């Protein structure tokens, strides 16, 4: 039916085909869904965050504040929460970062399962130890101040 999506060095090998024929889910059920949570319910202190064992999870370190643009964290976790992944296969998501920025972003994330929030800057290694950074499948460093900062030197300090 659909066109054969072809990977090759050049389109000649591609044209060779003609030349040489010879309430668990959301409304549509396309992604997983959960009852609208509360931020105070999902905020973890460092002690219980260390207590909560995490293995093979995802740690998203976010740099931001109350005055910063909003990266669409929702469409970041949407492919992770795809329905074709089983519930046990759902990699845990832990957003480590400032509480203000996550508060401004929590309105689009309360409808997702297995998502946790850790207030505190990513630069502190104690917070990373608390979320078991060594046991995570991936650590994603993201900065929300990519645009407010204009100087070249002041750019990408936090990420590096």
């Amino acid at each position: 039916g659909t066109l054969g999506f072809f990977i090759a060095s050049d389109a000649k090998e591609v044209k060779r085909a003609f030349f040489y024929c010879k309430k668990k889910y959301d409304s549509t059920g396309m992604f997983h869904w959960c009852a609208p949570k509360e931020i105070e319910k999902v905020i973890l202190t460092r002690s219980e965050a260390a207590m909560t064992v995490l293995s093979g999870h995802v740690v998203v370190c976010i740099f931001g504040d109350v005055s910063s643009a909003l990266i669409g964290l929702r469409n970041l976790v949407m492919p992770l929460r795809a329905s074709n992944f089983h519930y046990h296969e759902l990699k845990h998501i832990v957003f480590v970062g400032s509480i203000e920025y996550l508060k401004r972003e929590w309105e689009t994330l309360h409808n997702f399962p297995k998502v946790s929030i850790l207030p505190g800057t990513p630069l502190s290694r104690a917070d990373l130890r608390a979320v078991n950074i060594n046991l995570c499948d991936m650590c994603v460093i993201l900065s929300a101040n990519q645009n407010n900062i204009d100087d070249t030197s002041l750019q990408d300090k936090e990420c590096i």
Binding site: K24, Y25, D26, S27, T28, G29, F31, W33, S83
Partner: peptide, 15 residues
């Protein structure tokens, strides 16, 4: 926005 919905065989066909 996205909203929750019940599970149907149509929904299971999207899984």
């Amino acid at each position: 926005a996205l909203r929750g919905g019940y599970s149907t065989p149509q929904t299971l066909a999207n899984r």
